[PDB]
Amino acid sequence: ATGGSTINFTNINYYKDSYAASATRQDFTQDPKKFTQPVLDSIRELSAPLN
């Protein structure tokens, strides 16, 4: 945290093109549930999977 009044500037671009710029803007998005649990019928952690 901290960094009071550090006036950061990075993403400013000197060219008319978008791909000339510098990464990132980051991303915090995740969706593990599509790779880890890609099943039709949802299964709870309490219940046994197969009944």
Partner 1 sequence: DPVEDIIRAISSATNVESAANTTPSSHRLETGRVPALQAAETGATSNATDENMIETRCVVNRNGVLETTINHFFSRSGLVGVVNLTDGGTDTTGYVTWDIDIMGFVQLRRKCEMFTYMRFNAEFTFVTTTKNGEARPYMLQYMYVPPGAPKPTGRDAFQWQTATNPSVFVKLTDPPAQVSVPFMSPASAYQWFYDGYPTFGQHPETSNTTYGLCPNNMMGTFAVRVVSREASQLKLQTRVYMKLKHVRAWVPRPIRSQPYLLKNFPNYDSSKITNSARDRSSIKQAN
Partner 2 sequence: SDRVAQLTVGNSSITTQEAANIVLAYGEWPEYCPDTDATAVDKPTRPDVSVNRFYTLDSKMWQENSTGWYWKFPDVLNKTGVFGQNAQFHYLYRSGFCLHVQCNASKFHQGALLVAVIPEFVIAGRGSNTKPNEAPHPGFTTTFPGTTGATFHDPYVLDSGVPLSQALIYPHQWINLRTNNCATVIVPYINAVPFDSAINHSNFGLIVIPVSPLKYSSGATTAIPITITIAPLNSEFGGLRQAVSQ
What is the x/- site pattern for partner 1, positions 3-32, by CB under 8 A?
A: --------------x-xxxxxx-xxxxxx-
Q: How many residues bind partner 1 (CB under 8 A)?
A: 28
45 part of the interface to partner 1, by CB under 8 A:
yes
11 part of the interface to a second copy, by CB under 8 A:
yes
36 part of the interface to partner 1, by CB under 8 A:
yes
CB-facing half-sphere around the CA of 4: CA atoms within 13 A: 0
Q: Which is nearer to partner 2, 2 or 22 (CB)?
A: 2
CA distance 2 to 32: 31
Amino acid (1-letter code) at residue 26: Q
